Amino acid sequence: SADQLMSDIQLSLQALFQKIQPEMLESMEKQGVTPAQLFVLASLKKHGSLKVSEIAERMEVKPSAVTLMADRLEQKNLIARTHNTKDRRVIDLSLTDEGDIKFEEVLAGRKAIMARYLSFLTEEEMLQAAHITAKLAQAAETD
Amino acid sequence: KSADQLMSDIQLSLQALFQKIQPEMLESMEKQGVTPAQLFVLASLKKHGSLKVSEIAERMEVKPSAVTLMADRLEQKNLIARTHNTKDRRVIDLSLTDEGDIKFEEVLAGRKAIMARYLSFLTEEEMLQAAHITAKLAQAA
């Protein structure tokens, strides 16, 4: 009965979120980074280098919004700006050593929080959860 | 894959899912003309009929002064009514208008459709596994 099943899940997800979101936010605030800054750091760990216009695009915000995130990060010495080799006028971002370390400290913090919940799963359920979340995340990236 | 790597892949899938689902739910609400704080006012009135500002404030764990601003704007939108309390007429009761009731159901339907879509990617078997897993994670901690 799909509708009861959706109500069960919604209630489950809503309780997990209210419980996990504050913990994530509090851990971030202590490491000094916001969700948007974390998003930039993660995009740069994955892609190595990105144009300011590329990050703006993925985040669906104005180039100027990213430039302010970049200012905050550069001031904390977590990223560097360089001129693009194809067009000197366009700005590339990349991680510094210190930014790589900061992205890793934040992520490990997030992992440790999640794993307190996930550790109540049996091995069968862990494997199921790996597969379902990966499949949902794949289908969602394709839009 | 080890147990700690699995928990690592799960985290990264959840993170990618959440960063798509959060903005979509927000967007759906912004389009409806209702903030998350306002929705909670509408939800409480739907569930209980009429409440004083203080009672709503207590349920939301925010200051009465905040709920008073929320009520003023909701009244302006014609989503709630403000009336005199029977016991003390200087105290205000809040209740839904039919427009507010409709708005509230529209917001709930918008959220349910966003989640029916993410889950339509799963088989029924997987749906049932996801329900059991989420239910147990919720009851554990």
Side-chain angles (χ1 to χ4, degrees):
Chain A
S1 173
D3 277 36
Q4 184 56 54
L5 189 61
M6 282 188 260
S7 283
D8 298 330
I9 287 178
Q10 187 280 329
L11 272 176
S12 304
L13 294 175
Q14 184 209 310
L16 290 168
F17 182 77
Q18 288 163 311
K19 228 179 284 290
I20 286 159
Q21 193 243 39
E23 237 178 313
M24 308 264 79
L25 291 184
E26 175 203 320
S27 176
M28 292 197 84
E29 276 174 53
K30 176 66 260 198
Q31 290 295 306
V33 334
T34 60
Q37 287 169 29
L38 177 68
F39 184 99
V40 176
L41 291 185
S43 305
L44 295 184
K45 186 53 178 275
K46 171 152 258 162
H47 287 77
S49 184
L50 293 172
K51 305 163 162 166
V52 166
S53 74
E54 286 179 308
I55 286 175
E57 204 170 0
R58 292 141 187 266
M59 298 186 75
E60 302 187 273
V61 300
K62 302 281 196 171
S64 53
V66 179
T67 287
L68 180 61
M69 286 164 214
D71 282 335
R72 295 190 188 274
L73 290 166
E74 186 161 49
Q75 184 266 147
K76 299 188 266 187
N77 179 48
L78 305 182
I79 68 165
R81 300 193 226 223
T82 48
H83 301 296
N84 182 271
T85 57
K86 272 81 174 130
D87 188 334
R88 67 164 186 75
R89 299 166 299 176
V90 337
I91 305 304
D92 295 336
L93 303 176
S94 54
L95 301 171
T96 59
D97 281 355
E98 286 99 332
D100 188 75
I101 292 158
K102 201 56 165 196
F103 173 72
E104 221 61 59
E105 292 181 343
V106 171
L107 203 74
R110 287 177 148 261
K111 166 184 197 331
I113 282 164
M114 187 58 37
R116 281 199 350 274
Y117 297 86
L118 295 178
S119 63
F120 288 89
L121 300 178
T122 64
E123 295 89 356
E124 293 186 302
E125 287 161 351
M126 192 78 71
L127 285 153
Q128 288 165 9
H131 175 267
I132 293 166
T133 49
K135 177 169 182 193
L136 292 172
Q138 190 179 310
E141 295 275 353
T142 73
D143 50 21
Chain B
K1 277 176 173 180
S2 110
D4 278 86
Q5 167 69 300
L6 283 172
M7 290 191 271
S8 201
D9 301 343
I10 282 156
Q11 168 52 207
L12 299 167
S13 307
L14 292 173
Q15 165 71 38
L17 278 167
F18 163 74
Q19 83 196 13
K20 260 146 182 41
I21 287 167
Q22 195 192 52
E24 191 170 48
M25 315 232 83
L26 266 290
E27 194 155 69
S28 183
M29 277 190 66
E30 288 191 70
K31 184 187 87 68
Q32 313 282 267
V34 163
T35 53
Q38 286 154 27
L39 182 63
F40 193 114
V41 176
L42 303 184
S44 302
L45 298 180
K46 185 66 178 104
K47 186 128 202 306
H48 308 90
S50 301
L51 300 170
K52 303 190 268 158
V53 169
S54 59
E55 292 174 303
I56 284 176
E58 277 192 336
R59 290 187 194 275
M60 292 180 58
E61 291 170 40
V62 308
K63 295 177 170 184
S65 69
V67 180
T68 292
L69 268 193
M70 299 174 211
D72 180 68
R73 188 26 164 165
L74 288 160
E75 192 197 26
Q76 193 183 331
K77 291 166 140 34
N78 208 0
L79 306 178
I80 71 172
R82 299 178 53 241
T83 52
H84 293 95
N85 186 261
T86 52
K87 184 207 171 250
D88 191 331
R89 290 309 229 68
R90 301 156 294 179
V91 177
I92 302 298
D93 294 334
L94 304 188
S95 41
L96 285 178
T97 54
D98 299 321
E99 293 100 315
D101 185 62
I102 290 153
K103 174 91 349 203
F104 180 65
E105 292 302 335
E106 283 176 347
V107 168
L108 255 40
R111 294 179 99 71
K112 170 173 173 198
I114 286 164
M115 278 294 169
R117 199 179 82 260
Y118 280 88
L119 299 220
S120 76
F121 301 131
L122 302 182
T123 55
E124 197 175 350
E125 176 178 337
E126 295 167 327
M127 286 185 230
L128 286 149
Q129 291 178 1
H132 167 77
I133 286 172
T134 50
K136 180 190 184 168
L137 293 176
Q139 196 169 288

